[PDB]
Enzyme design. Structure first.
Site, short mmCIF file in Angstrom:
data_model
loop_
_atom_site.label_atom_id
_atom_site.label_comp_id
_atom_site.label_asym_id
_atom_site.label_seq_id
_atom_site.Cartn_x
_atom_site.Cartn_y
_atom_site.Cartn_z
N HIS A 1 0.81 -1.21 0.00
CA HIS A 1 0.00 0.00 0.00
C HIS A 1 0.85 1.27 0.00
CE1 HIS A 1 0.79 -0.17 4.38
NE2 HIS A 1 0.60 1.14 4.33
N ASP B 1 -0.09 -7.59 1.98
CA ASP B 1 0.40 -6.23 1.85
C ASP B 1 1.93 -6.22 1.73
OD1 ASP B 1 0.68 -3.49 1.79
OD2 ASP B 1 -0.59 -3.12 3.54
N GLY C 1 3.93 6.40 8.90
CA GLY C 1 5.23 6.79 8.38
C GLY C 1 6.24 5.67 8.56
N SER D 1 5.26 2.37 7.54
CA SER D 1 4.84 1.31 6.62
C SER D 1 5.95 0.90 5.67
CB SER D 1 3.62 1.76 5.82
OG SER D 1 2.42 1.51 6.54
N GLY D 2 6.08 -0.41 5.47
CA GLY D 2 7.17 -0.97 4.69
C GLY D 2 8.36 -1.25 5.58
#
Ligand SMILES: [Ca+2]
Ligand SMILES: [Ca+2]
Ligand SMILES: [Ca+2]
Ligand SMILES: [Ca+2]
Lengths: 67, 223, 223, 67, 223, 67, 223, 67, 67, 223, 67, 223
Positions: L40, L84, L175, L177-178
């Site tokens: 995402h 995801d 902030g 994510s990933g």
């Protein structure tokens, strides 16, 4: 409903405080309050209240009802 | 309401009824635990009733919750009726549904001419007495404070506003106190006082709610 | 009457009630044998009740006298309600005293502004119903044909006049028809029709009695 | 009192003549009359009459009462 | 609508077109000032188009009235499309007549098998695109919630009902949302969502209007 | 009508998100949305939307159109 | 009365109705100023209604006279209902005539088997409720104190007697209390109590007037 | 008529005193009285009374009515 | 405490039910109950109750108090 | 208690006070959430007060817990006062400790002559009224059924026993109902009724608890 | 930083979908998203996004921020 | 990271920052040319920044390499956030050294209770916003799928695991994510989603990397 007598139409034309007295000795539940119609009235409902509305002469110019 | 119309069952889901055996005053739900009304409706041991159309018939979609706390505005004047507003805490929260919902407190004050919805179970006659089984409603524009002061010389505060018609005929009456006065989706007024009902040159007088959002927000956080 | 007051016991000795099991119309007494009412109040076997303040309680000095004859004005129009006037002969004469008296027919049409007395047992609410026990009265000026025709465009005839208030609030209602409209001690009008009750810009419409004194005098002598 | 059903609050919002049919259907002592609200109304009281008041669109905008 | 017929000009006088340069959603007129549509059709600066058949050709007798206020149902869920209902107030009242009329709100829910009229300016193809110039109509029966829950496992709330055919071929499509679904002369459904257009086993999903008469009735008064 | 490219028949057989990227890169007026055939679709019309319908594997099995 | 017939207008001219907003008890006139009733019909501010047939419709030949004095028998026991008899003095005398009359006191106790007339406006159903507009009557034999004490083991005093039928079906009911039980033209009993209405093996129980003639004659002379 | 609720068919099968409580809770105008049907009942009419009739079990075996 | 008048010593010597009447007229919060003195008495406390205790003749031989 | 002694603070830890504005009845705690009292103390919305001595002064160390459920014995007879026993569940369990403890239910009945502890906040005078500051106690013997039925002829059931003195002087009184009567550590009786207070030959009549252990044990599990 | 307005403490108490429209009206660079708080939120950072968080009643109960 | 500590300059050399004019997502380095992140976080034209500590200050040992390829997992469900995960191929390889290094793939899933490290440049407050200049880290145990399914009823797939604390206070945020979730020196999870930050009973949700090693291993070989 409310306890006791609810209206006193026969007291129209009488003096406010006399009306208050008679009203109170007839209904042991209510506090009679003589007030002028020119004045302001709260919009609540009370079974223990009878407004004796009078004018600039102190005469009852409206039926005292339990409200 | 004098000279109004039958709203229908739960057209006003935020309308609440203050009870002590009989319906003595009205109120408005602001959240699932709090109800705003008029300060002159202050009693000892109130039972708040939500989701009611016929107050003489148990229809099934009704909540009867006791009041645990009742708070009058510290500057309430019993004589001049200034700051006639009172908050009430429900002993336990109420189930919010289609029949029972709360209403939004205003952002800003409404302007004169704004069509507002006034509701209640008060008296329904200009002269004499007749009380409805069903909740009554009435639309009415907010009036200029020039007209509001002309109607009530030296009795209108900066916390009061008049609504209805100086023609008379249509106005809130005895038993409507604390009732909601809703404008553009928000609670703008509280049914307070007046001189008789539906009388010429003397409309209804209502507590200005746009002045108490801070205290209302503070009271629920502090209490 | 909507927005009226309590007259008091027999302050209107000429006000009579038309009865068909229930109270359905009002009436005025002109002599010991005749009653002036509205034409659209005509029924089968009317009972006339004279000298009564409370219709749900026996006073003691009432007179229940049957109708033996009822005569509608020949020019009575069922739709435009023009010439809405009817005379009712009593089967037996009525005992005229303090509680029961007649009223004098006019000799002149009253002017706009003349304060009149409107009386009856009709509905006492602009919206909803509230039927009283005690006779209701009202004070109301005569309105100009200008205003009366402005209210009802092309519905006002030469035999009609409007009374009440353009503002509203105060008006005659359902169950007041046939009732008297008294000016300067003399019968000027008869409660006829209107648009709803106590509605803005739609005052009460009344039959002009001064245009029927001749026909009243002719009917009584002929029958 | 008048015989049968006295009020029809539930019929507010229906079309006038449907309401008339239902009214005469439930109370076989009345004659339902559909009328416009800006039209004239006589001020007599009848137990056999139920005014069905509508507006410009023919929808019931007033509670059909027995008067 | 996919696989419907040509209605004919203004055979659906309550059908309105939501415009913002192009037609993006349909709507139903409920009174002279209010239009019921779908919540997911919410946009800013909406222009309502009433009394139209050919949306690309100015026929005359068309009303283009801007939206002044738009209120989405408070409990609207953008992920489950539950409570997919929105009310739109017009900047001014619309002239009601032959070609522009409103529609009555239901007093009850309908039964499975009830034939309903679905109307719109949406896509008319199962696969691909071909948008009509003329309003298209379709008649489809109401399906049981057995079939509706079997078709859409765990995606049907009590605020939704399915209409159309489990066969396919006939269905509402893209550009029909907010559109009227009328049964027995009353608006009972609103074109909401579905899986594809005119697909086998996957008919149309429509918002159940009978559960919102109270809110619809409340919204119009408060606003 | 809608501005820009309307249909993307050449992207049938590709993966949804790359196709979405290309769609946005070619028409700056649209917001490409990768959805499943299985899923439900609103029946509104938007020029600022290009549905990229995919299946079990995430491959485009329908010509992306501006609706 | 349960299982009785319609008396007809004023066939029981001595039947009086105790009123207080609603009909609650019955009674029997003994002279111009005095009424016999049951002690358990005691209230503050009784309004006696004489010359009545339809208590819901004002007929014309009726007298509404207030109570000024109410006297319960000194030995009345609210527990066992023994000596259940009360005398009510009317504020002013009533006009005795064809429709308003009194009944003569008994000089001796009637025998078992004597056909007596029982009257009243009481409930007209064994199970369920259905209150009549018109006064109801019934003929009932006097039962043996053997059968009376068999029906009510150890509850019958020598001041009580049972009337009605061992079969059931026909009996006095709620709203008949204070009512007359006349035999051979003289008031012998007063509708007092029982076990339900018109039930099997439990008939009506009435106050024995022939034990109190002395009391009533003293009380009226002293008060 | 009599004020408030008049008939409680809902409370048949309940224990007399709880039903009485429900009655007084719903109709503020009445005083509910639990009585056994083997006993005697007075034949007066009261708008301020609801006889909660029970049997030897204590279960309400008759619809509590305002009489 | 209990509201209103509490004792009625001036009614000692009168008849049970007249006394009951007067008591109810002067204190609208209590229900006067005429009781025999050799009868049984519950030992609870009620501010809404005034026992009017009488004897063989039905005369008040005990000061009516709010208990 | 008439003619008793001052117990001392919390010398009777199981004694609880029934409150509904004022103290109206006594009671006994049997476990963490149940209180045994008399059936004729039945109110709606009772508040139980545990660990008290001065009921007019908050001393701390008290528990005010709302009554959740209240069950009268099914066979309770309001006239013969038979089966005068009621159980009360507390909304939440009470904190057990030094001043707040429960009491044991009997395994058998006590005999005549067994000295027992009667406790309460009732009246303390044989004639007149004087309600105590502090919980009052009394030790009184159990009397034989002979003396009990000789005292109260045909008023004593098998569920009733007499406790006190045939001389009088010392007795439970008004406001003591529901109060505990304990013998050799276990609750044998409940303060119920009598004939006056501390009257000669008419002592206290108390509910025989030993006949209710089963029902008490059944109700706490079934509820 | 991110372009345009970043904070909207003003719209706390407003209904979510009006607050959203206001937000996009003031900041042309953001896509306002109404979302319930019991739901799950992705943890990316966007200058193009303003989460309009509401509860069951649809009222905003978190300050709408550009994140 | 909410409630984390300052990592220090490049103590996490496999932490990469996704840039596009500003920091929007995080990621992990798996080899010279490939970076793992959350699906995402997809954007057109990502600029990967390696060897970063203070993202707002150019320090010298950084590497700004443009993305040439971006591949989302074919089964990624945007609504339920299942799968995801996304791989990114840099335009050119990076200089692996002291401050730029890659992290090893997992060979087996870790069990509940394992202490993992979570790093990122996300928001650092539960309420309000305060974005750091320096990379933030946090140690958090793996929560059981029982607790995970309890925290999120029917929202946790076979490819999701919760981490953090059921207490709250410390959690990943917007902030992150990933961002990497490494355990025993190997990348176990990917910062995916949650319900707010550091909220009670709603910890962080992370993509289960151990289910995609085959997919990652295959994707770099085919692209
Ligand atoms: Ca056109
Ligand atoms: Ca009568
Ligand atoms: Ca204390
Ligand atoms: Ca840097």
């Amino acid at each position: 409903e409310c306890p006791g007598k609810q209206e006193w139409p026969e007291l129209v034309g009488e003096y406010g405080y006399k009306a208050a007295a008679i009203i109170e000795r007839e209904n042991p539940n209510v506090r009679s309050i003589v007030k002028h119609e020119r004045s302001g009235f709260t919009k609540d409902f009370r079974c223990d209240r009878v407004w004796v509305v009078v004018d600039s002469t102190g005469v009852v110019v409206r039926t005292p009802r339990v409200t | 309401i004098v000279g109004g119309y039958t709203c229908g069952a739960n057209t006003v889901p935020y309308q609440v009824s203050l009870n002590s055996g009989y319906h003595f005053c009205g109120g408005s739900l602001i959240n699932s635990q709090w109800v705003v009304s008029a300060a002159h409706c202050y009693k000892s041991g109130i039972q708040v009733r939500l989701g009611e159309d016929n107050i003489n018939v148990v229809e099934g979609n009704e909540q009867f919750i006791s009041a645990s706390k009742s708070i009058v505005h510290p500057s309430y004047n019993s004589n001049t009726l200034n700051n006639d507003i009172m908050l009430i805490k429900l002993k336990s929260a109420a189930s919010l549904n289609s029949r029972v919902a709360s209403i939004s407190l205003p952002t800003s004050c409404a302007s004169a001419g704004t069509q507002c919805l006034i509701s209640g179970w008060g008296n329904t006659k200009s002269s004499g007495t007749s009380y409805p089984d069903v909740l009554k409603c009435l639309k009415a524009p907010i009036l200029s404070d020039s007209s509001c002061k002309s109607a009530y010389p030296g009795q209108i505060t900066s916390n009061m506003f008049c609504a209805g018609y100086l023609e008379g005929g249509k106005d809130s009456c005895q038993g409507d106190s604390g009732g909601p006065v809703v404008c553009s989706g928000k609670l703008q007024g509280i049914v307070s006082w007046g001189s008789g009902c539906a009388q010429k040159n003397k409309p209804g007088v209502y507590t200005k709610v746009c002045n108490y959002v801070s205290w209302i927000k503070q009271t629920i956080a502090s209490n």
